[model samples]
Target: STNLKDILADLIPKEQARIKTFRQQHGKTVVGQITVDMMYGGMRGMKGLVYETSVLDPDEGIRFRGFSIPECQKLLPKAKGGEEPLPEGLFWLLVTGHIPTEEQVSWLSKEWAKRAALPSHVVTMLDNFPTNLHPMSQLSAAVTALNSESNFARAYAQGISRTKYWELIYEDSMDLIAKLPCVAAKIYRNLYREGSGIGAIDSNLDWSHNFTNMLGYTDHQFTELTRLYLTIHSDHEGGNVSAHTSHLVGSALSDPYLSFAAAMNGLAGPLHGLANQEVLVWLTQLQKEVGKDVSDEKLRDYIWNTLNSGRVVPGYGHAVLRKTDPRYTCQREFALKHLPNDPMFKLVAQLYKIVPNVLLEQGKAKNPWPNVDAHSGVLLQYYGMTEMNYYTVLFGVSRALGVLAQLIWSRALGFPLERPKSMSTEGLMKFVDS
Candidate 1:
């Protein structure tokens, strides 16, 4: 089977042709109107961006390359002796919109492994960071440092043709993605497991497995968990903060490292990728207050108390999803299969049973359902990765696959720099008066 690079090269032209034809035929089409509420409310439902990697359906959650999360779990190629989908397969699917053959997946796995090494300067930069710094900050810094070694940066400086920008971007994105696991693992080691030296990458292992291994986890279940975690967290849709930031920066011809670092900063926000950490914090407090095996009435009362206290329940609502997030469902399934009896998982499952009803009864939330953040932290803590602050760094590592893939496409299509108009409050009032 053809490798990922060759497959992408063959597919890009056809897609570009399709884009050109669509623009010529129907470029004037209007999909939706942007209301004033949309502008003031963070542009929640505006369809102002074009993301080819995935689409988020409010009812169904995310669909990557037309496949549902469950479909990807079933159809994407898995590593040897593993049940979860290899993230390499997901990356290939996201970039090329094709389900890769096993051979192709294997090739891509080895390819990323070969590119996974960090430069000495990057290692030194990471070493010099104060351990008190947040892992997300370290992760973003490491990514920015990686820019000094960027193939795209070097190529662009040498006056390469504009038409060839995507080719180097493809290389830089792949390299950035390959190195992220190492950078993130190092941060985890430095911050939490200070004495447990980072593990070397095993060339034979798949991307997620090696990432887990480097973080000093050898249990095969954790490896499988890593696979599932990375695959599911890889992308939601490009409109989310991190993905949008990456695309926006890349549109300015920023290399993958610079673009993805900008994305990581956005991912560090409390309302975005940091929700998983908040979920763990809230759940831990709930467990302490309500006991491990609290009765349904008590759990309901606690949830109501939380809601009544003027603090929203973290991880219980999503901006777009109306039903339970499919990502949450997948994690629930994994917990049931793996850690069903664990206290935290049980608490999470209990919340899954109780929180939504309370949220529905409260009548404030638009989508009163648990999102992916609801369960991810419990699973990580179960695997002994209980450092809540570092969770978004893991998210950043997985997100590199999707955002960087889109970066490659943005360059390939020569997408213009993103610049949206803003209205002052006075102007808005005037317009409202008119």
Candidate 2:
């Protein structure tokens, strides 16, 4: 991982000076919005949110610790003989604000390994879930079960001092993270294996590598795809649905398990996780309708007709981005390097051309450009992992890395129990009328 966060930490005076100027001189208050929101229902125009996480100027795009996606890909740590940035590297950078060398990433991988065993009760409880249950259900159940297992929950039952309460919470955090790989891998095992032969992690490998081992494919290709996919999607700036939910739920001081589950539900939506599915389904159908091949002209016509039928061009709209999604762009680069001539590659290219022009003309479709979901499924299909239903599980694995770190910090910062006020539609209507 690139040590970009070190750069930011070193430049703290500059960072603080900018924040001070924005507050005192420019009327920009990034942290003040929280005070405003708690006092009000919610503050509008969250210009401050950008500065809180990363700032994105259209020309510069996201500056997370002042590193763009490309910079992360180029400068961040990657695995041995692996092209994608190792998530261990990214996590180190995210937590410590410095890019780790490949060796440092190896050190972090080993640390994560030491923290990686699941509790026996967790395994037993998850075993109770019919293997037929959805992986998300298993994930949710396994996480919340920690509450029942909480030392504090038991302490409160037995009456403990408030001063020591955070200790159990701290233990709960470690236990939950340590077991995530086990739980996630178990989900895959239950599905794929004829019988449950659940195995613990092999600490000798990266977490993703062990995940590959459990999922029944340790092929180099699969590992490469997993590494790239997991790293790239770990986080976005805080405005998109899932990240926003994480932040919003976090603001209420919700526990990591609870907050992350809420955000996962957001990720489960059609406009989010399901977008990858939508792209694949759209392509499969389009390929069917057009027979073996269609020229670019007919493809464009088909696209227009599809849109005219009141359909969205899948993977082609964003709430904030004004151009192609950097996430999508990173995947596109992966595609060009790996599968230069995939037919789906051509389909994406054709859609990329047809969609933006139509969106630019429509005058209402905001950011009518492909996001990462557009190119990702295609690249994945090239790598032989095409099942759309299972695609989200892959996303969840990558997602756990970032959100888990964020949760760890949130808890460490002494964030309280998260609670937020809500207004009914009646309340909203009255406000609008007033």
lDDT of each: 0.89, 0.67
True-vs-predicted CA distance for residue 54, candidate 1, Å:
0.4
lDDT of 2 by residue, 1-434 (tens): 33323343354445446655766876742344443343353443354343133445555455555678888888987777778877777766655556778777776666667767676787788776785676766776776665555554576578766434444444554455555667777766666565476666777788678777767676787787777787777766666666667667765645556666777777777667888888888888999899546787888788779878998878887656778788888877777777778888878877776778877786778687888778888877776666566677777666665665555444334445545566666776686577
Candidate 1 per-residue lDDT over residues 12-96, each given as its tens digit: 8998999999999999988999899999899988897998898999988999988999999999999778799999999999999
Task: Give me the runs in candidate 1 sitting further than 4 Å from their true place.
Answer: 432-434
Alpha-carbon RMSD to native, per candidate: 1.3, 5.1
TM-score of 1: 0.97
Looking at model 2, report the run of 10 residues with the lowest lDDT sum: 44-53
In lDDT terms, how accurate is model 2?
A: 0.67
Local error of candidate 1 at residue 176 (angstroms): 0.7
Candidate 2: stretches off by over 4 Å: 1-60, 147-178, 251-253, 411-434
